[PDB]
């Protein structure tokens, strides 16, 4: 939500990904990860590709939360018009990762 400075909004959302890649990520924090998903809908489309990657980096490690959280995010990017890509690629991937 930062103050309105758009840089952290990405850059915070990055350092996450940095750790969202790295050890000890999800379960202890879930909503707090999904809450800002909305903050992408509201604020600058800047946040999309960061949101793309934030959310994506998640999708990799833990798929429990992934599936949940299927529908929530399905509606998320509707308002934010994105509906793409690599995150979806992951979504496809890891749904298929469930088929696999």
């Amino acid at each position: 939500d930062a103050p309105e400075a758009p840089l952290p909004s990405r850059k915070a959302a990055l350092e996450t990904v940095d750790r969202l890649t790295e050890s000890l990520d999800f379960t202890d924090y879930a909503s707090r990860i999904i809450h800002p998903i909305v903050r992408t809908l509201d604020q600058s489309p800047e946040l999309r590709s960061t949101a793309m990657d934030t959310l994506s980096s998640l999708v990799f490690q833990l798929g429990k939360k992934y599936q949940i959280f299927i529908p929530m995010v399905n509606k998320v990017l509707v308002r934010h018009r994105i509906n793409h890509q690599r995150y979806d690629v992951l979504i496809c991937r890891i749904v298929k990762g469930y088929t696999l």
Partner: protein, 306 residues
């Protein structure tokens, strides 16, 4: 009684888009025990409902909860709800939390779905439910929980150091709220030492939040029994001091009780001497009916005036 809803079937089932809240604010009084209400408990939760119009069509099937026949549908209701917590709806966060409270609760998925909301924490009080919200369920199978629990304090206890506060109070409410979980709390009770220190060293802030520090010390002491005989006189001392700074003392009411429910009793009025006078002090001063009230119990449950 019956025909009241009998046509309302088609009605409640069918649209009237903004209103069916009041369709379903009804029934909800009452009954109509035929199996349609089953499916009626279903499809309007199968649409389900949208856009803040949600809370009661959640509450409803919670009020519409019943059993035992088709066990799918029963926790299939729950299934839905469980998913539904997340989606914004800040009281509807709470409200479906606020529901259930009995029953069925179990499916190994669910705690793993229950827990994350404890892991929200946002908003604070949302968590504060599931603690107690599992407070029972804790003791069904600690298997999932007790450790999922044990995490939490192990997560929570460290929050005593980190500056101040707004969390250190968001420590408080989650402190007891597991205490409906008993045994774990028993087998540790180092929450003493943590918190025993938490009050002593001062003065950190306004610290207005302190008062809820104590509530937990209390409710703990219940499960804490003669075990709790540790550390006391200090508390008796400290609190006995704490009685006379920094007022409202709603706790010392509830506080001092449980200590004496852990039974230092009559010699206490030696160690701390003046408590008599110290109470004999308060009694006229404060109104605060409980304070008027509880001093009695304080007195009463203490003693036996000698």
């Amino acid at each position: 009684s019956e025909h009241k809803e009998i046509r309302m079937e088609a009605a409640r089932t069918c649209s009237r888009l903004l209103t069916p809240s009041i369709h379903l604010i009804s029934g909800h009084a009452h009954v109509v025990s035929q199996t349609a209400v089953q499916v009626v408990a279903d499809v309007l939760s199968k649409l389900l409902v949208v856009g803040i119009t949600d809370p009661d069509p959640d509450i409803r099937y919670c009020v519409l909860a019943s059993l035992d026949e088709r066990f799918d549908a029963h926790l299939a209701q729950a299934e839905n709800l469980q998913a539904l917590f997340v989606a914004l709806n800040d009281q509807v966060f709470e409200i479906r939390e606020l529901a259930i409270c009995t029953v069925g609760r179990l499916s190994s998925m669910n705690p793993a779905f229950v827990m994350p909301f404890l892991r929200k924490m946002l908003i604070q009080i949302l968590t504060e439910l599931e603690h107690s919200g599992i407070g029972r369920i804790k003791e069904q199978s600690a298997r999932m929980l007790g450790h999922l629990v044990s995490n939490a304090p192990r997560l929570i206890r460290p929050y005593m150091e980190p500056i101040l506060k707004a969390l250190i109070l968001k420590l408080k409410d989650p402190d007891p709220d597991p205490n409906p979980g008993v045994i774990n709390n028993v087998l540790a009770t180092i929450g003493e030492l943590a918190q025993v220190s938490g009050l002593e060293m001062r003065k950190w802030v306004d610290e207005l939040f302190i008062i809820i520090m104590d509530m937990l010390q209390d409710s703990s002491l219940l499960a804490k029994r003669q075990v709790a005989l540790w550390t006391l006189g200090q508390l008796v001392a400290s609190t006995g001091y704490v009685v006379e700074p920094y007022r409202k003392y709603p706790t010392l009411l509830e506080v001092l009780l449980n200590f004496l429910k852990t039974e230092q009793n009559q010699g206490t009025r030696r160690e701390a001497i003046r408590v008599l006078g110290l109470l004999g002090a308060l009694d006229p001063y404060k109104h605060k009916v409980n304070i008027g009230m509880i001093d009695q119990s304080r007195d009463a449950s203490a003693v036996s005036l000698s």
